[PDB]
Subunit: 213 residues, 2 copies
């Protein structure tokens, strides 16, 4: 029951922070938890950097070719997830994940049949702009509004089916949770640290390093 | 026309970053722009720290007693705003404001009669929780969704009237923009840097220092 397989769609992740790549910081955070028995990393075909990393020969790491879209790479990862009952999907560019948040997320397998994700409550006042221009239409109630983060933890086959159906029906998919939502599910929100950022822009690297060390 | 009076409701701001208090970093960012001819700082009665700051004897700074609510302190500030046609309201705890953002915000007085605010576009996927629990109701479209920041720049008397009416009618007020919104106005959104954070929690101080220096 407690066995978990992680999937990291990695098809910025190769930038480094302390002689270790962001991807490695990311993957090592997952492998720190005892329940994570395997990590499947989906990389783009032609990606010649991964093979030169220590992760390439790790006994608990399996590499597979990813796809064009995020959901595509996650589905590819799920195919090498063995018989794992629960899957943990985590961003390749989120190296600041903390063990306490991860542990609280994994607890969901004992109290939920849908799974859930790490999220941070909205602090700032939010505004909805008017369609087509930079004018404020109205203020969006921030109460009950959350920033979706990762990992996202769900039963393996359910995640597979939801993302498979969402794609077939051409649904607008953002994160893994949105695939469950599209199929009528309502994943749990597990509060996590706001410093769990995704390195996407140049400045993000320096900030990630600040958070990490 | 171009004369602007700033109001800072300061009734964390006294924590320091480099031998200078957050309030000072904040106020000095406003005074850096030539158009800001005056800064009215509203402090709580009994606040004995302000008087011991250099801001207390600055020729362009006026101090007044603030109130119980934010809108209350801003209204008090507006009373000492002289005949300024446009007012710039800025958080006492936002020391990372940059001159380029400020300058672009002030340009609104030449192209708008309602004013506007500094804001950062939402990046993360947002989730709306179900009423009463930590379960995801659905994903909130982040397109056209913005993080409201400060300064907030509006015609002086209009701001006064909108906040005066909003309060009298017991409306739910968050920022100054929300007061204009309540009265049927739609302030402009001027994109600003996301590093313009408000120091509210212990960790925010270290982060602010990182952004500043
Ligand atoms: Ca391990
Ligand atoms: Ca000046």
């Amino acid at each position: 029951h407690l066995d978990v397989c992680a999937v990291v769609p990695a098809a910025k992740q190769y930038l480094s922070i302390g002689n270790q790549t962001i991807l490695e910081h990311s993957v090592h955070a997952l492998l720190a938890h005892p329940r994570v028995k395997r990590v499947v990393i989906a990389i783009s075909p032609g990606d010649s950097r991964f093979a030169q990393l220590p992760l390439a020969n790790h006994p608990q790491i399996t590499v597979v070719d990813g796809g064009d879209e995020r959901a595509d790479s996650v589905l590819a990862g799920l195919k090498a997830a063995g018989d794992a009952q629960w899957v943990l999907v985590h961003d390749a560019a989120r190296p600041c994940l903390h063990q306490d948040d991860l542990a609280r997320l994994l607890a969901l397998s004992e109290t939920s049949r849908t799974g859930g994700i790490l999220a941070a409550p909205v602090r700032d006042t939010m505004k909805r702009a008017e369609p087509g221009k930079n004018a404020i239409a109205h203020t969006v109630d921030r109460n009950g509004l959350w920033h979706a983060l990762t990992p996202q933890f769900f039963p393996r086959e359910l995640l597979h089916d939801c993302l498979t159906r969402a794609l077939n029906e051409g649904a607008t998919i953002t994160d893994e949770a949105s695939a469950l939502e599209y199929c009528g599910f309502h994943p749990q929100l597990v509060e996590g640290r706001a410093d769990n950022i995704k390195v996407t822009r140049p400045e993000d690297l320096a900030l990630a390093e600040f958070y990490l060390t």
